[PDB]
Design a protein around this ligand. Structure first.
Ligand SMILES: CCCCCC/C=C/CCCCCCCC(=O)O
Ligand SMILES: CCCCCC/C=C/CCCCCCCC(=O)O
Ligand SMILES: [Cl-]
Ligand SMILES: [Cl-]
Ligand SMILES: [Cl-]
Ligand SMILES: [Zn+2]
Ligand SMILES: [Zn+2]
Ligand SMILES: [Zn+2]
Ligand SMILES: [Zn+2]
Ligand SMILES: [Zn+2]
Lengths: 266, 266
C-alpha cells in the first residue's frame, strides 16, 4: 500500500459525548512520512501510544498541557482507509461524537483519498503475544492482513457473542454505534463524563431491553463497535497494522496495554 | 381574591419533552372575566376540561383541529399564583418543558402580577366525592383553602410516601421536577413520545438508583411533583379551586376524570 492523505481539508463538528461541549475537526493534508497527528492550541499531539493520558470510557491523548478526548473513532476510520499523513486540527477538548459510529467520518474521508509517493511501512506483529487483566484478554499473532475478532460476555440479553473483521469488510463495522448499559450511566455522569450522551449518539441497553426507539442496526452491533474501537486503538502503534487479533471482553485500557507491549517488544 | 393577569407579555421557549420540537410561549394580559385560554394558529383553546384530548404521559388540549401538549405545568403555576385572565400564545405543538418543574414559570409570573377589578369566582367543592380506577384513587371534599395531598406507592426504592400542599407553601412544589422510571422509557419512546426527554429535564429513577448526577432535590421530589401536576389538572375546572384533595397513586387520567365529575355535579 501507498501512504495516503486527503485531497483537501475535511471538517466535522458537533458535541463531545463526554464533555458535552461543541467542538470541530479539520483534517489537513500532509506530505509523505508525516504521520497522523492532532493539533490543538498550537501543540502537535502525535496519534501514538506515548501520548495516551486516559483510557476509561475513551482513549485520550495529551501533550505539553494540551489534551484531546475520544480519538478512537476517527483514528479507527483513518486506520481502515489507510490514511497515513494528516493533521487533525481540533477546536475543542474532544473529538465530535456525531452519531456514535464512524459512518460520517468514513464516507467523507473515503472519497477524498490521495495516494502519495511511498510504500506504507506497516507495523507487523512478528510473534504471538497475550495480555490479560481481570478475566479480560487480548491475543495477537502474525498475519499478512488485519484481522480483528471481539468476543463479548454480557450480563444482559446480548449474552455471549463474537464478531470478526477482515480487510474488505470495513462497512460492516463503520456503522456500529457506541453503546452503554443503563447500569453504567450513573457512574459515567458522577465522574464528570458522558455529558454529551443521548439516545441520538448512544445505544442504551437495559438488562433485556433496548431503550433506543430505533433498536439495534445488527443483533450484534455492540461487539462490532468493540472491533471498531480496538482497530482505532491499534493505530496508536504509529502506522497501519498487519496482524491477527482476538479480544475477549477487551476495552481501551487493555487495548492500550497491548499496544504498548507490542511497541516495546519491537 | 381579586382576578389577576400580567403587567406585560412574558415569553418562554425551549423544547417540548414529548415532541422534541422547539416551541415558544407568550402570556398576554387580558381583561376581567376573560379566563385562561391558549392561542394557536388562530384558534383559542380554553384551559377547560371539555377540551382535553389526551391524558397519557401528559394533559393535552385541542379544539377545531389545533392541539397543544403538556399544559399541566404552566396551568399549575397559573393556578398557584391565581392568575385568572391571560392568553397563552403557543408557537409549536407543546408547552416548553424547560427544567421539568414550574420554577422558571413561577418566578417570572410572580413578579408581573396585576390585580384587577373583580372578586374571583372560585370553584368550590360542595360535597365529598371519590373516583377510583385500577387501585388508583382520588378523593375530594369541602375546604376554605386549596389543600392537596399525594400518596405514592412506588415499586422502586422511593417505596411508600406522601406529601401535602397547603396555600402558602407554593415554593415547596414549584421546584419539584418531572420524573420517570427507567422501566417506562422504552414504552414512552415506542409510542412516539418523550422525544425531548433528557436528564436535564427529567429525573430518571432506577429500581434503587437515581441516574441524574444532581440527585433528588428532596427525598420525596416525585410525590411533590405529583401534587404539582394535580394542581395544574384541577385548574381545568375553569377557575381557582377551593377544596381538600387526597390522591393515592393518581395520574392525569384520574385527575381529569375527577375534574369532569366535579364539574358535572355542579
Ligand atoms: C440525557 C439522556 C440519556 C443517555 C445518556 C447516555 C450515557 C452516556 C454514555 C457514554 C458512552 C461512553 C462510551 C463511549 C466510548 C467509545 O465508544 O469508544
Ligand atoms: C436511560 C436514559 C434516558 C432519559 C430519557 C428521558 C425520557 C423522558 C420521558 C418522558 C417523561 C414523561 C412524563 C412527563 C409528564 C409530567 O411531568 O406531567
Ligand atoms: Cl470506570
Ligand atoms: Cl457530535
Ligand atoms: Cl415545566
Ligand atoms: Zn469510570
Ligand atoms: Zn467506541
Ligand atoms: Zn404575542
Ligand atoms: Zn403509554
Ligand atoms: Zn408534571
Amino acid at each position: 500500500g501507498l501512504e495516503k492523505t486527503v485531497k483537501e481539508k475535511l471538517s466535522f463538528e458537533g458535541v463531545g459525548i463526554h464533555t458535552g461541549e461543541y467542538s470541530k475537526l479539520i483534517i489537513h493534508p500532509e506530505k509523505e512520512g508525516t504521520g497522523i497527528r492532532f493539533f490543538k492550541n498550537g501543540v502537535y499531539i502525535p496519534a501514538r501510544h506515548e501520548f495516551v493520558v486516559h483510557t476509561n470510557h475513551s482513549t485520550d491523548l495529551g501533550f505539553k498541557g494540551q489534551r484531546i478526548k475520544t480519538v478512537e473513532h476517527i483514528l479507527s476510520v483513518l486506520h481502515l482507509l489507510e490514511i497515513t499523513n494528516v493533521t487533525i486540527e481540533v477546536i475543542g477538548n474532544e473529538i465530535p461524537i456525531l452519531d456514535g459510529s464512524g459512518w460520517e467520518f468514513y464516507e467523507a474521508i473515503r472519497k477524498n483519498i490521495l495516494n502519495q509517493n511511498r510504500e506504507i511501512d506497516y507495523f507487523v506483529v512478528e510473534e504471538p503475544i497475550i495480555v490479560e487483566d481481570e478475566g479480560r484478554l487480548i491475543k495477537a499473532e502474525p498475519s499478512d492482513t488485519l484481522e480483528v475478532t471481539y468476543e463479548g460476555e454480557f450480563k444482559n440479553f446480548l449474552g455471549r457473542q463474537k464478531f470478526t473483521f477482515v480487510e474488505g469488510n470495513e462497512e460492516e463495522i463503520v456503522l456500529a454505534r457506541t453503546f452503554a448499559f443503563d447500569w453504567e450511566i450513573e457512574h459515567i455522569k458522577k465522574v464528570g463524563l458522558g455529558k454529551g450522551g443521548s439516545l441520538k449518539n448512544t445505544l442504551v441497553l437495559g438488562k433485556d431491553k433496548v431503550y433506543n426507539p430505533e433498536g439495534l442496526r445488527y443483533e450484534n452491533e455492540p461487539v462490532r463497535h468493540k472491533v471498531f474501537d480496538l482497530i482505532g486503538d491499534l493505530y496508536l502503534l504509529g502506522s497501519p497494522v498487519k496482524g491477527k487479533f482476538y479480544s475477549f471482553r477487551g476495552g481501551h485500557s487493555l487495548n492500550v496495554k497491548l499496544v504498548k507491549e507490542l511497541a516495546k517488544k519491537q
